[PDB]
């Protein structure tokens, strides 16, 4: 089995930007989630080969993970906060799509998503 190439973290054809909202997403949101005890499954792309998930990338066509998000934020890959927020939501939703509703990994994702929502509730006004 093979994994796909990971999502890109830089692209010279994609305009780059910094905003205070993106800074918040790095310094508050990602930082909070990354240090959590349940972060580890989400700190890098799903390794379908080592996890013995031959159907993962048959089901999940928009993979995303916090390692990718972190690199995107550090690289100023995003134009706006919405793009980054979408990547976090993709990550959580992928977990719920692939895994069974009662699974431990789903409970982990839910804990992280709750924190995510609490932090994005205070996303600053752009300025």
């Amino acid at each position: 089995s093979m994994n796909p190439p990971p999502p890109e973290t830089s692209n010279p054809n994609k305009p780059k930007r910094q905003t205070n909202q993106l800074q918040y997403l790095l310094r508050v949101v990602l930082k909070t989630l990354w240090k959590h005890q349940f972060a580890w499954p989400f700190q890098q792309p799903v390794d379908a080969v080592k996890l013995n998930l031959p159907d993962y990338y048959k089901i999940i066509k928009t993979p995303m993970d916090m390692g990718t998000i972190k690199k995107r934020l550090e690289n100023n890959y995003y134009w706006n906060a919405q793009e980054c927020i979408q990547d976090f939501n993709t990550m959580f939703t992928n977990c719920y799509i692939y895994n069974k509703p009662g699974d431990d990994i789903v409970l982990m994702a839910e804990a992280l998503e709750k924190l995510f929502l609490q932090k994005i509730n205070e996303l600053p006004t752009e300025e």
């Binding site: 013995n52 699974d103 431990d104 990994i105």
Partner: peptide, 11 residues
């Protein structure tokens, strides 16, 4: 059985 971290589970 199929799934994350479940290969060695059988009941």
């Amino acid at each position: 059985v199929a799934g994350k971290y479940s290969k060695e589970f059988f009941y």
